[PDB]
Amino acid sequence: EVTLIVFHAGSLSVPFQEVEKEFSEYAERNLGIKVSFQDEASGSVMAVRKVTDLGRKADVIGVADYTLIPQLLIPNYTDFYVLFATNEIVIAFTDKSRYVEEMKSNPDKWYEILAREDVRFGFSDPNQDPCGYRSLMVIKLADLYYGKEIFKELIEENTNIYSNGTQIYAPKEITVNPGKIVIRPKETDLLGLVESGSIDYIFIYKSVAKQHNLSYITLPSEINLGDFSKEKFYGQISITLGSTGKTIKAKPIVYGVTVLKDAPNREVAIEFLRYLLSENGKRIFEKNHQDFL
C-alpha cells in the first residue's frame, strides 16, 4: 500500500483528480499495489514553497508555470522537469454579472467595462499563484496592445500593486479597494464568488472556466499568453514577487511536473508521472478542456 504525496496548481485540480483515480486502478491491475493519494491544491508558487520553505516532504510537484521548477527546485530538490500542458487567460462571468450582455457583444471593450464604478473583478494573489501574476501581466500587456493606461486605471488606482515601466511588482502584502477588487490565494478560490454574483468578472484559465461551465470572452492573442507565436510581444513584460523576491517574465503558458529526488515513494511516483504523460493522461486532460503541450 502506497500513498503518493502530490502538491499541485489549483488549475490542475479537475484533471489531476481523474488522473489519480485512473492511476489507482492501473496500479492495482498492472503493478499489484494499492495506491492512494495525499493530494493538495494551492497556487503553484505556494506548492513549491511547501517544500523549499516549510520543509515538507512530497513525491510529485505539478505547476502551472514550469519556470518555478528550475528557478526554485533545481538542483537542490530535483534535477528535471517535464513540460506537458498549456492554457490561456480569459475573462469569465455569469448571467449575474453587471453588463454581461455588453461584455459578450463588445469583448474588445472589456477594459472599459471593468473600469466602470459599479463593476467588481477578481484575480488571485501573484505571490502565491501564476494565474494571479499572469492576470496582472495580461492587463499590463493590454496597455501596450491598445495604447491606453489600462493597468493604471484598473490596478494601480485600486491596489498597492505598481509597475516601473514594463516591470510589475507585487508587494509581499497586497491591499485592494474592496469596492472594485477581490483577491484570493489561488484562482479556483474565485469560482464561488463569480458564481454567486458577488464579483462580476474574473481573470482565469480557459480550461477552468470551461470545467465549471462559466461563460467567458477570449482576449487578443497578443495579451492572453496562450499563443506561442506571440512570445516576443509577451516578453515585453515581467513581474517580481514579494513571496520569492524573484522575477518571472511574461511568456506562453506551459505547465511543468517533476518528482523530487528524495521522494518517499520514488518509483511509484515516476510510474504516476508516465501515466500522466501517456495517452490516458492526454485523454483525461482533453476531456476536461485543457490541451497538452
Question: Per the annotation, does 11 bind a ligand?
Answer: yes
Q: How many whole angstroms separate alpha carbon 225 and alpha carbon 180?
A: 24
Question: Per the annotation, does 205 bind a ligand?
Answer: yes
Q: How many whole angstroms separate alpha carbon 109 and alpha carbon 94?
A: 18
> Which DSSP helix (H) or strand (E) runs through 285?
helix 279-287
Q: How many whole angstroms separate alpha carbon 158 and alpha carbon 254?
A: 30
State the SS3 of 39-107: EEEECHHHHHHHHHCCCCCCCEEEECCCCHHHHHHCCCCCCCCEEEEECCEEEEECCCCCCHHHHHHCH
DSSP three-state, residue 292:
strand
* Contact of 206 with 89, CB cutoff 8 Å: yes
Residue 63 grid cell: 505547476
Q: How many whole angstroms separate alpha carbon 46 and alpha carbon 63?
A: 10
Question: Per the annotation, does 130 bind a ligand?
Answer: yes
Question: Per the annotation, does 13 bind a ligand?
Answer: no
DSSP three-state, residue 33:
coil
Strands 162-164 and 247-249: unpaired
148 DSSP 8-state letter: S
Strands 254-259 and 60-63: antiparallel
Using alpha carbons only, give the angle 271, 277, 283 rounded to the nearest 5 degrees.
120
Domains and CATH numbers, the chain: 1-86+254-293 (3.40.190.10), 87-253 (3.40.190.10)
DSSP secondary structure letters along 168-180: EEE-SS--B-TTT
For cell 506561442, what's the residue?
228
* Contact of 196 with 122, CB cutoff 8 Å: no
Question: Per the annotation, does 187 bind a ligand?
Answer: yes
Using alpha carbons only, give the angle 101, 287, 26 rounded to the nearest 5 degrees.
155
Nearest to 114 by CA among 210, 217, 232, 228: 217
Other beta carbons within 10 Å of 79: 12
Nearest to 88 by CA among 239, 209, 258, 240: 209
- Determine if the peptide bond prior to 75 is cis (ω within 30°): yes
Residue type, 207: S
Let me know if 100 is exposed, middle or buried by CB neighbors in 10 A (0-12, 13-18, 19+): middle
Header resolution in angstroms:
1.6
DSSP secondary structure letters along 228-252: GGGHHHHTT-EEEETTT--EEE---
Using alpha carbons only, give the angle 196, 197, 199 rounded to the nearest 5 degrees.
115
Question: Per the annotation, does 234 bind a ligand?
Answer: no
Other beta carbons within 10 Å of 177: 11
